Each structure stands twice: as structure tokens, then as C-alpha cells.
Design a protein around this ligand. Structure first.
Ligand code: CLA
Ligand code: CLA
Ligand code: CLA
Ligand code: CLA
Ligand code: CLA
Ligand code: CLA
Ligand code: CLA
Ligand code: CLA
Ligand SMILES: CCCCCC(=O)OC\C(C=C=C1C(C)(C)C[C@H](OC(C)=O)C[C@@]1(C)O)=C/C=C/C(C)=C/C=C/C=C(C)/C=C/C=C(\C)C(=O)C[C@@]12O[C@]1(C)C[C@@H](O)CC2(C)C
Ligand SMILES: CC1=C(C#C/C(C)=C/C=C/C(C)=C/C=C/C=C(C)/C=C/C=C(C)/C=C/[C@@]23O[C@]2(C)C[C@@H](O)CC3(C)C)C(C)(C)C[C@H](O)C1
Lengths: 178, 91, 146, 167
């Protein structure tokens, strides 16, 4: 009858607590219109996990090359330490290598993403799935919830760091002046 | 809005609209509607005259308050039609 | 954006482009971004880009306002079926009025297609009539073939 | 019934002792005219804004400041803060709450939720546990809301008039 995250708005009809990180947070009702259309929230959850995991990797990579040495610097020595300028300075060889690897990996991902298989657990691509062999159901759900929390935090973190580096050029307590 | 969730506002068999057409103002009396419509007409025509007739408009003289008050003239028309509708509906 | 926030938006019209301006060069160039000079740019014989930018900015205000007319999941708004149902003139002048038109339009795709095609044909005639009378692109007026 | 504060007429229909601060004061039928839940939410919102406005005005005029402030009187503090920038950030921060309030008002007036106007369920210490506490605190809140509306109106008008010290 009422959301848990926002305790003065109605609970989203689409969300019903049967998902990791379901705290009834949908003021717009994007989930509501999705289920009214006829879809299911598997796609949005998988997009959440994908965006988040990318955001965590990119958060660490935003500050690593400055706080720690920018590699042994055979070719990277020319490229600036500012992440917003490093993107426009990768050499063609390295840019093509990384682009090809990402493209092949996500072309592999696409078929299972857009399949009709119900066995597919959302955000379960088999990469390092061996540590859940011994985990219990409560442990599995709680670990997936820590994953989702980290995802959700890193997504906002990149927006903060990107806008701060664009408008100020410096993150305040950590990396400065880059 | 769907086909089902829509009020019965057809009034071709009757002499005046139902008050439901007025929506949020389905209960404000005809007296309030008429007084507000008259004040709106006077204020809006004053604003329009002060903006373009008494003065000459320009980049350095366009006035936001007069521009906004100009929009009370069509609101005045709506309010006077509303006053008639509520007077006929008995409110 | 200090003029925009202070509300002194006439500073964006102040200092328009001069009549001796040459398109693509800084000589004779102004600083105004939003003007209503009208007429045509003398060198190019096309309307001022400041005028066109002001046009698109204002027209958008109007359309973004008008896009809050109808009721969508928040109570405030309008009901098109209700509007059509009530619009019947007194004493049955236009018969039963516009009753049933909502149902027919929303059920029949051909009526929607016909309305769209009529509106778009009128708009195509309008652009044909307006582009030649009021050129908007630089040096198009002297390009007679185009 | 025959209204209080206008003892020669009757309170409009919505005023029936249902809500806090109902002193039977609506001579123009201006709440029987339009839904009184919206009226009460507007009253509460005005009152909260004016409570915060009065206390902030007094604090800034007395000398309360932030780690980086223009250090100016609270009258010109609006222009100073705007030119500095963070006032627009306050605009975004309150706009988030106001869009969520758009949602809440829509559900409250439609009937999807049994929400009282100006009730965001912000009760950390359960200061409204029993209904007696609920009406007592609502009464106090509305009285303070109205009084703070008047207080800030007086303070800001007087400051814009004379441009003097705190009082
Ligand atoms: C700390 C955050 C975090 C958490 C809690 C999880 C949790 C999980 N991930 Mg992982 N994941 C992460 C980061 C995280 N991930 C990142 C950054 C990526 C992008 C590369 C991924 C990409 C990813 C995929 C594609 C998959 C998982 C899977 C899993 C599950 C099993 C692996 C495990 O137990 O990891 C344990 C994590 C750690 C011990 C932390 C390592 C910290 C390093 C050393 C810091 C440097 C589990 C729900 C798989 C799954 O669904 O399994 C059934 C799965 O398919 N994750
Ligand atoms: C001249 C003949 C005529 C007679 C009526 C009669 C009626 N109309 Mg109206 N109507 C007319 C012409 C007419 N209409 C025309 C030409 C249009 C097309 C624009 C409309 C569009 C229209 C709508 C959309 C609605 C009505 C409704 C009604 C009913 C209530 C009227 C009322 O009390 O409004 C009361 C009006 C007010 C209290 C004031 C509001 C009116 C002003 C003009 C709004 C201005 C907004 C502002 C300028 C926005 C910014 C502009 C831009 C930048 C976007 C009534 C049956 C309403 C209904 O519910 O019917 C079922 C309704 O929803 N009419
Ligand atoms: C000629 C065109 C036309 C007509 C006839 C109407 C008529 C109406 N509109 Mg409006 N409307 C129009 C154009 C029109 N609209 C346009 C172009 C827009 C887009 C900006 C809107 C957006 C709009 C919304 C979003 C809503 C209406 C609603 C209404 C009703 C208002 C009743 C009222 O004023 O009560 C008296 C009003 C009050 C007690 C509260 C406001 C009081 C102050 C004085 C308002 C001042 C505003 C003014 C423009 C300046 C009425 C039936 C409401 C409805 O539900 O109708 C079914 C509604 O929620 N209209
Ligand atoms: C904008 C602020 C605001 C709002 C939205 C409301 C809303 C309400 N008050 Mg009011 N009230 C206010 C300020 C406000 N009050 C102030 C400052 C005081 C003086 C201390 C009061 C004292 C008061 C009492 C004693 C009572 C109410 C009650 C009401 C209700 C019905 C009256 C009505 O017409 O609705 C609100 C309509 C308006 C405010 C109209 C606009 C004002 C005019 C046009 C301005 C011109 C005058 C001024 C010089 C400027 C409603 C919930 C009654 C209640 O609780 O009923 C349940 C009730 O008993 N109010
Ligand atoms: C930040 C944007 C914003 C938004 C979306 C709203 C929304 C609302 N306010 Mg308003 N309000 C605002 C700022 C805003 N307010 C501020 C800064 C204050 C403090 C002075 C108030 C104080 C206030 C009171 C005291 C009351 C309202 C009321 C309302 C409601 C109806 C009137 C309306 O359309 O608002 C006006 C909308 C605008 C002025 C447009 C915003 C323009 C800026 C420049 C854009 C920002 C966009 C934002 C970031 C998204 C609605 C929930 C009334 C109500 O009945 O509530 C139930 C009511 O009583 N507001
Ligand atoms: C009605 C409510 C209200 C209003 C309109 C204002 C208005 C103002 N206050 Mg505030 N103030 C309030 C309540 C209010 N205050 C209260 C209740 C207190 C007492 C605790 C204060 C105490 C206070 C101080 C001590 C100072 C101000 C200052 C300011 C300025 C804006 C600073 C800003 O936006 O940073 C906030 C916005 C951001 C940092 C970004 C968004 C918000 C967060 C961080 C999320 C991101 C402006 C004059 C400053 C001023 O005027 O200096 C001369 C100042 O120094 N206020
Ligand atoms: C003048 C003092 C005053 C009083 C007596 C109340 C009383 C109340 N407020 Mg609070 N409130 C105040 C000022 C006050 N408020 C101000 C200035 C603001 C603006 C920040 C708020 C914003 C506010 C909100 C948003 C909410 C309350 C709620 C409440 C209730 C429980 C918490 C409480 O009592 O906290 C004070 C002790 C109660 C009716 C909550 C409620 O309605 O719970 C039922 C609620 O949702 N208040
Ligand atoms: C509810 C709280 C409140 C309080 C405590 C005060 C108190 C005061 N006001 Mg008032 N004032 C109020 C509300 C309030 N006002 C409101 C709501 C308004 C807006 C209409 C005003 C508008 C106002 C003006 C325009 C002036 C005052 C002034 C004054 C001061 C001297 C007037 C005097 O002695 O008159 C005889 C008793 C006095 C300290 C005067 C001033 O500036 O004093 C220095 C003054 O000129 N007030
Ligand atoms: C103020 C003095 C007193 C006033 C009294 C008054 O009026 O009462 C009410 C009344 C008669 C009455 C009375 C009763 C209701 C029977 C009882 C009342 O007694 C009570 C209630 O107790 C008093 C009494 C006897 O009088 C009737 C009043 C009728 C009135 C005043 C009708 C104006 C239409 C205007 C139109 C159509 C304009 C279109 C204007 C157009 C088309 C535009 O220009 C639009 C526009 O270009 C603009 C401007 C800006 C541009 O951006 C673009 C747009 C397109 C937006
Ligand atoms: C914006 C901003 C700030 C901020 C911020 C915040 C809060 C940032 C937060 C960032 C956050 C929360 C970042 C998470 C990273 C997670 C990692 C690295 C996980 C990797 C995990 C990997 C690489 C796993 C590899 C595996 O192969 C292993 C080893 C075992 C196998 O079985 C399989 C798996 C796949 C498991 C500052 C800095 C505070 C300053 C100022 O406030 C402004």
C-alpha cells in the first residue's frame, strides 16, 4: 500500500519485494508502465547491474593513474593524467584492441541478454561463478544485494567525478589539480 | 485517461453543461467566477494597454508582469463562461 | 547566463548585428544572441540567425507549455473524451455534437492517418510558400535554381 | 456550524472540526469552492517555508554564516548567494523534493493513498504516537505556521523598508 523507500508515496505495483534491492523506489513507475506493456524487469535489472559494474571499474580507473604511477610509461608517458583528456589521447592500436575486446565480449553477451531462456539468472554470466558453490541462499541473496548497492553507488560516483573534473578540474579531498 | 475512466459530460439533451466540465472549479460559485472574470478582464486589458498601446514595446521595455497579466484576458473569458454555467447549474 | 537569471533579457538583444556585417567574418559583427530585428540580413538576403534563434526559443516555450494540457498519471490535466463529449452546442445545433468522435478517432487508424496527412500537406504548402518569400539560408535568394 | 471568528455566519461545509487549527475562518467560501486538502497542504507548505525563512533571516542578520559565505546582510544575501552560485543548487535540491511532492499531492487528491496534507511521514522519534499527540502537534504546527508566515512577512518588509539591524 505504501513504498518502503519513500513512506509517503504508494508502493509501486510492479515491484513486490521479489527482487534484489526492491525497496519500492519508483516514483515515476517505469516498472509500472513496463509491466502494463507486458515486459518484465529482467532487462532493467540487468542494465542496472551492467551500468553499475562498469561504473565501479571506471570509478577506480578515474583516480588510479594519478594517485598511483601511470604504468611504466612506454607509450602512456605522452597521455595526460586527466581522465577526461586521456580518452582523447589513446593511440589507435590500443584503442582498437580495447574496443575489439569489449565488442566481442558484449556481442557474446547479447544473445543471452535477448533470449527467451527463463533459467538465466539476471546478471549471471558465469564469469567467476565458482565462489557461490558453498554459499547458502541467504548468503547468495545478501551478496547480490551488496553487489547491487556497490553498483548503485558507483553510478552516482561517476557523475560526480565527471562533472567535478569538467567544471572544477579537481576532486576535493583525493586527487587534485589534474 | 482511457475510454472507461472519463466523466459523462455530454449535455446535448439538456440546456446547460453539467458543472463537472469545470473540473477543479466544479464547486467554486458563479459569484466568485464572475467577480474573478471581471477583475481579470480589467487587469489584463490594463496590462495590454500599458504594454503595447499606452507605451511602445521594445527590447528594453517589455515587462514580464504586463505580459503575464495579458494572459488573464482569455482566463477572463473562461471564467465568465464558467460563471454562466454555474449560475445555470445552481451554484 | 547572468542576464538570463537576473531577468535583464534585453541585454541579449542589445548590440545587434550591423547592416554592414559580412557573413562568416567578425567585421560588423554584434554580440546579441536573441533579437527581433525582422526583415533580412542585407549581405545574405536571409533572415537574421538571432531572429531565428529567438523564434525557436519562444515557440518552444509555447509548445512545452501546451504539452502539459492532458491528464497523465497525475490528476491535473484534461480528458479528451470529456472535452469532445461536452462540446455539443445548445438546442442540438450540430446534432449530438462531437460525441463518439474520441472513440472513432482512437479506434480507427485511417482517420488519424487522414488528419495527419491533411495537416502535413498544409504544412508542406506553408513551407513552400514561406521559404521563397522569407529565405532563411545564406545566399539562397540569389541561387535561383535551388 | 455558526462559525467561530465570524459569529454572524456559518463556516463553509469543509470546516466541520475535522482538521487541526479549524477556527471556522473562511468567510468567502473559498475552501468549499475548491478542495480543502490542497488548501491545507498549501497552508502547511507556506508555514514551513516561512518558519525556515524567519529563523534563517534572523540567524544571518545576527551573524551566523557558513565556512565560505559572502558575509553580507540577509537582505542582499539573496543576490550575493545567487551570484556566488549555491542558491541554484538549493533550487535543484528543493526541486527534487517538489517533484516528489507533485507525486504525493496527485496520489493524495486522487485517492490512491490515505495521505493527510503536509504529511511526509517524517517522524524519527515517534513524537506523534497516540492520536492525542497527533492532533496536539498538528494544532501547534499550524499555529506556528500561521504565526511564522506573519513573522517573516513583517521581518522582510521591515528590512526592505529601513535596512537596519536584526529588529
Ligand atoms: C565488490 C563488489 C562486487 C560484489 C559484491 C559482487 C558480487 C558478485 N559478482 Mg561481481 N562484479 C564486480 C564486483 C562485485 N561483484 C565487478 C566490478 C564486476 C565487473 C567486472 C563484476 C562482474 C560480475 C559478473 C559478470 C558476474 C559477477 C558475479 C558475481 C557473484 C559471484 C562472485 C563473487 O562472489 O564475487 C566476490 C567479490 C569479491 C571477492 C570482491 C573482489 C574485490 C577486488 C579484488 C577489488 C580490486 C556475486 C553476486 C557472477 C554471478 O552472477 O555469479 C553467480 C557473474 O556472473 N560479477
Ligand atoms: C466559443 C464557444 C465555446 C463554448 C465552450 C464551452 C465549453 N468549453 Mg470550451 N473551447 C472552445 C470554445 C467554446 N467552449 C474552443 C474554441 C476551444 C479550443 C481551444 C475550447 C477548448 C476547451 C477545452 C480544452 C475544454 C473546454 C471546456 C468547455 C466547457 C467549460 C467551459 C468553462 O467553463 O471553462 C472554464 C475556463 C476557465 C475557468 C479558465 C481557463 C481558460 C483559459 C482560456 C486558459 C488559458 C491558458 C493559458 C493561456 C496557457 C498558456 C498558453 C500557451 C503558451 C500554451 C464548456 C462546455 C472544458 C471541459 O471540461 O469540457 C468537457 C474543457 O476541458 N473547452
Ligand atoms: C481555451 C482553452 C482552454 C479551456 C477552455 C480550458 C479550460 C480549463 N482548463 Mg485548461 N488548459 C489550456 C487551455 C484551456 N483550458 C491549455 C492551453 C493548457 C496548457 C497550459 C491547459 C492546462 C490545463 C490543466 C493542466 C488543467 C486545466 C484545467 C482547466 C479547467 C480550469 C478550471 C479553473 O480555472 O478553475 C479555477 C481555478 C482554480 C481554483 C485554481 C487556479 C486559480 C488561479 C487564478 C489560476 C491562474 C492561472 C492563469 C492561467 C494565469 C478548465 C475546464 C484543469 C482541469 O482539470 O480541467 C479539467 C487542469 O488541471 N487546463
Ligand atoms: C497562503 C496561505 C494560507 C493558506 C493556503 C491557508 C489555508 C487555509 N486556511 Mg488559513 N490562514 C493563513 C494563511 C493561509 N491559510 C494565515 C496567515 C492566517 C492568519 C493567522 C490564517 C488563519 C486561518 C484560520 C484561523 C483558519 C484558517 C483556515 C484555512 C482554510 C480555509 C480558508 C481559505 O479560504 O483557504 C485559504 C485561502 C486563502 C489564503 C486565500 C488567499 C488570500 C488573499 C486573497 C490575500 C489577500 C490578503 C492579504 C493582505 C495578502 C485553509 C486550509 C481555517 C481552517 O483551518 O479550516 C480547516 C481556519 O479555521 N486559516
Ligand atoms: C524547484 C521547483 C519547484 C517545483 C517543481 C514546485 C512545485 C510546486 N510548488 Mg513550489 N516552491 C518552489 C519551487 C518549486 N515548486 C520553491 C523554491 C519554493 C520556496 C519559496 C516553493 C514554495 C511553494 C509553496 C509555499 C507552495 C508551492 C506549491 C507548489 C505546487 C504547485 C505550484 C507549482 O506548479 O509550483 C510552481 C512551479 C514553478 C515555479 C516552476 C519551477 C521553475 C524553476 C526555475 C525550475 C526548476 C525545476 C526543478 C529543478 C525540476 C507544486 C508541488 C503550492 C502548493 O499548493 O503545494 C501543494 C504551495 O503551497 N511551492
Ligand atoms: C526558507 C528557507 C531559507 C532560505 C530561502 C534561505 C536562504 C539563504 N540561506 Mg539559509 N538558512 C535557513 C533557511 C533558509 N535559508 C535556516 C533554517 C537556517 C538556520 C539553520 C539558515 C542558515 C543560513 C546560514 C548560516 C547562511 C545561509 C545562507 C543562505 C543563502 C543560500 C545558500 C545556499 O543556497 O546554499 C545551500 C545549497 C547548496 C550548498 C547546494 C544544495 C544543497 C545540498 C548541499 C545538496 C547538494 C540564502 C540567503 C548563507 C548566506 O546568506 O550567507 C550570507 C549563509 O551563510 N542560511
Ligand atoms: C513549529 C513547530 C513544528 C511542530 C509543532 C511540528 C509538528 C509536526 N511535524 Mg513538523 N515541521 C516543522 C515545524 C514543526 N512541526 C517545520 C518548520 C518543518 C519544515 C522542515 C516541518 C516539516 C515537517 C514534515 C515534512 C513533517 C512534519 C511532521 C510533523 C509531525 C511530527 C514531528 C514533530 O512534531 O516534529 C517537531 C517536534 C507533527 C505534526 C510529519 C507528519 O506529518 O507526521 C504525521 C511530517 O511528515 N513536519
Ligand atoms: C506578526 C509579527 C509582526 C511584528 C512583531 C511586527 C512588529 C513591527 N512592525 Mg510590522 N509587519 C508585520 C508583522 C509584524 N510586525 C506584517 C505581517 C507586515 C506586512 C504587512 C508588517 C509590515 C510592517 C511595516 C511596513 C513596518 C512595520 C514596522 C514594525 C515595527 C514598528 C511598528 C509599530 O510600532 O507600529 C505601531 C504599533 C514593529 C517592531 C515598522 C518598522 O519598520 O519599524 C522599524 C514599519 O514601518 N511592520
Ligand atoms: C470590474 C468591474 C465589474 C465587472 C462585473 C462583471 O464583469 O461581472 C461579470 C459579468 C456580468 C455580470 C454580473 C453578474 C455575473 C450577472 C453578477 C455580478 O454580481 C455578483 C456576482 O454579485 C455582477 C454583474 C451584474 O456585473 C460579465 C463580464 C463579462 C466579460 C468581462 C467578458 C469579457 C470577454 C472578453 C473576451 C472574449 C476577450 C478576448 C480576447 C482575445 C481573443 C485576445 O486578445 C487574446 C490574446 O491576445 C491576448 C489578449 C494576449 C496574446 O498573448 C494572445 C491571446 C490570444 C491570449
Ligand atoms: C565522487 C567523489 C568521491 C567518491 C566516491 C565513491 C563513494 C566511490 C565509490 C567507488 C566504489 C564503491 C567502487 C567499487 C569498486 C569495486 C571493485 C574494484 C571490484 C572489483 C572486482 C573484481 C575485479 C572482481 C574480480 C573477480 O575475478 C575475481 C578476483 C574473483 C573471481 O571469482 C571473479 C571476480 C569477477 C569476482 C571521493 C573520491 C570520495 C571524493 C569526493 O567525495 C567526490
Amino acid at each position: 500500500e505504501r513504498s518502503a523507500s519513500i513512506p509517503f508515496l504508494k508502493k509501486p505495483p510492479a515491484l513486490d519485494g521479489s527482487m534484489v534491492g526492491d525497496v519500492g523506489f519508483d516514483p515515476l513507475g517505469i516498472s509500472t508502465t513496463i509491466i502494463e506493456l507486458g515486459g518484465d524487469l529482467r532487462y532493467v535489472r540487468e542494465a542496472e547491474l551492467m551500468h553499475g559494474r562498469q561504473a565501479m571499474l571506471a570509478t577506480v580507473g578515474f583516480v588510479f593513474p594519478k594517485l598511483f604511477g601511470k604504468l611504466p610509461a612506454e607509450w602512456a608517458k605522452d597521455i595526460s593524467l586527466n581522465p577526461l583528456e586521456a580518452q582523447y589521447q589513446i593511440p589507435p592500436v590500443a584503442l582498437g584492441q580495447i574496443a575489439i575486446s569489449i565488442a566481442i565480449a558484449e556481442g557474446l553477451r547479447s544473445r543471452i541478454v535477448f533470449s527467451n531462456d527463463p533459467d538465466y539468472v539476471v546478471g549471471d554470466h558465469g564469469f567467476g561463478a565458482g565462489m557461490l558453490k558453498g554459499k547458502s541462499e541467504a548468503q547468495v541473496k545478501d551478496m547480490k544485494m551488496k553487489e547491487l548497492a556497490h553498483c548503485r553507488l558507483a553510478m552516482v560516483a561517476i557523475t560526480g567525478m565527471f562533472f567535478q573534473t569538467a567544471i572544477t578540474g579537481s576532486l576535493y579531498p583525493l586527487v587534485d589539480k589534474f | 485517461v482511457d475510454r472507461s475512466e472519463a466523466a459523462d459530460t455530454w449535455w446535448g439533451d439538456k440546456d446547460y453543461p453539467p458543472s463537472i466540465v469545470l473540473g477543479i472549479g466544479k464547486d467554486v460559485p458563479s459569484s466568485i467566477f464572475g467577480v474573478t472574470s471581471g477583475l481579470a478582464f480589467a487587469i489584463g486589458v490594463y496590462c495590454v494597454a500599458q504594454s503595447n498601446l499606452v507605451n511602445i514595446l521594445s527590447g528594453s521595455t517589455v515587462n514580464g508582469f504586463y505580459v503575464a497579466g495579458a494572459l488573464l484576458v482569455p482566463y477572463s473569458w473562461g471564467l465568465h463562461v464558467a460563471a454562466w454555467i454555474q449560475k445555470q447549474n445552481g451554484k | 547566463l547572468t542576464p538570463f537569471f537576473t531577468g535583464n533579457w534585453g541585454l541579449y538583444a542589445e548590440n545587434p548585428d550591423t547592416a554592414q556585417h559580412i557573413f562568416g567574418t567578425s567585421e560588423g559583427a554584434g554580440t546579441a544572441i536573441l533579437t527581433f530585428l525582422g526583415g533580412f540580413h542585407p549581405q545574405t538576403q536571409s533572415m537574421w540567425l538571432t531572429d531565428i534563434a529567438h523564434h525557436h526559443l519562444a515557440i518552444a516555450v509555447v509548445f512545452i507549455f501546451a504539452g502539459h494540457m492532458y491528464r497523465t498519471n497525475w490528476g491535473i490535466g484534461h480528458s479528451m473524451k470529456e472535452i469532445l463529449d461536452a462540446h455539443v452546442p445548445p438546442k442540438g445545433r450540430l446534432g449530438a455534437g462531437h460525441r463518439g468522435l474520441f472513440e472513432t478517432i482512437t479506434d480507427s487508424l485511417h482517420m488519424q492517418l487522414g488528419l495527419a496527412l491533411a495537416s502535413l500537406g498544409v504544412a508542406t504548402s506553408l513551407v513552400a510558400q514561406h521559404m521563397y518569400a522569407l529565405p532563411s539560408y545564406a545566399f539562397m535568394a540569389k541561387d535561383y535554381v535551388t | 456550524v455558526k462559525s467561530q471568528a465570524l459569529p454572524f455566519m456559518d463556516a463553509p461545509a469543509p470546516l466541520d472540526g475535522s482538521m487541526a487549527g479549524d477556527k471556522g475562518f473562511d468567510p468567502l467560501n473559498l475552501s468549499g469552492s475548491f478542495d480543502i486538502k490542497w488548501m491545507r497542504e498549501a497552508e502547511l507548505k507556506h508555514g514551513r517555508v516561512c518558519m525556515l525563512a524567519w529563523v534563517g533571516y534572523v540567524a544571518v542578520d545576527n551573524g551566523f554564516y557558513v565556512p565560505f559565505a559572502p558575509h553580507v546582510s540577509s537582505l542582499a544575501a539573496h543576490d550575493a548567494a545567487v551570484k556566488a552560485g549555491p542558491m541554484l543548487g538549493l533550487l535543484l535540491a528543493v526541486g527534487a523534493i517538489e517533484a516528489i511532492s507533485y507525486n504525493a499531492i496527485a496520489e493524495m487528491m486522487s485517492g490512491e493513498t490515505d495521505r493527510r496534507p503536509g504529511d511526509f511521514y517524517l517522524d524519527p522519534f515517534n513524537l506523534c504516537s497516540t492520536p492525542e499527540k497527533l492532533e496536539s502537534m498538528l494544532e501547534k504546527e499550524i499555529s506556528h505556521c500561521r504565526l511564522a508566515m506573519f513573522a517573516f512577512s513583517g521581518v522582510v518588509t521591515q528590512s526592505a523598508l529601513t535596512g537596519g539591524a536584526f529588529p
